[PDB]
PDB file of C-alpha atoms in Angstrom:
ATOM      1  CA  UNK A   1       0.000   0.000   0.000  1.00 17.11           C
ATOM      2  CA  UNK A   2       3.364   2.110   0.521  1.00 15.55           C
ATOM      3  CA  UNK A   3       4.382   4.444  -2.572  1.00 15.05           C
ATOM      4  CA  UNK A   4       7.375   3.329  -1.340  1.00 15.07           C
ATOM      5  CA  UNK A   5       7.289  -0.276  -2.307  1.00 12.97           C
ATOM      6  CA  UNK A   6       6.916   0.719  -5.594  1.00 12.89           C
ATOM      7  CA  UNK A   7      10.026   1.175  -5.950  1.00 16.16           C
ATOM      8  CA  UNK A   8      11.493  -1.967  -4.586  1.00 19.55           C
ATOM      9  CA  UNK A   9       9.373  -3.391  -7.619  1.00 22.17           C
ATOM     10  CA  UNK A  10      11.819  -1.615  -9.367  1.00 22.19           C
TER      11      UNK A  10
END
């Protein structure tokens, strides 16, 4: 739910 996890998809 984090924006932040977003960007461990990354």
């Amino acid at each position: 739910q984090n924006p932040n996890r977003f960007i461990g998809l990354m």
